[PDB]
Amino acid sequence: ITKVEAENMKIGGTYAGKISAPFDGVALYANADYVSYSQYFANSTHNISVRGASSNAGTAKVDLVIGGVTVGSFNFTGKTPTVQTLSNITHATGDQEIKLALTSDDGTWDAYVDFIEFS
């Protein structure tokens, strides 16, 4: 397993910033808010998990982008943190940017991101 905390990544966008509740992590508020870091991959295919939460009862959606290509998304509904998992995602090998980004914000929720895990 490879686990990287959101709070240790590059944080970007107009509003993105760290939070301490409901976990140590990062809040994404508006479209183009993101966290990213560079990951070396020896292998092409991983199960990918992100722990996160919504700011409210709504469903926060976070895109997963690897090497600039969107490979899936994670949905977090409600304020209680959950772990969301994409199974068997194939992506580029070598050094690749990993980004968790908002693209579907509409002023009804914010997304809280705790960590990403590759297995």
The three state secondary structure string of 95-113 is: EEEEEEECCCCCCCCCEEE
Nearer to Ca ion, 48 or 110 (CB): 110
**Nearest distance in Å: CB 15, Ca ion:** 8
For residue 76, CA distances in Å to 38, 52, 89 come to 24, 6, 19
The one segment of 36-44, 77-85, 89-97, 98-106 that binds Ca ion by CB under 5 A: 98-106
- Say whether residue 33 binds Ca ion (CB under 5 A): no
Binding site annotation covers 7? yes
- Cα separation of 87 and 110, whole Å? 25
Interface contacts to Ca ion, rule CB under 5 A: 5, 24-25, 29, 105, 110, 114-115
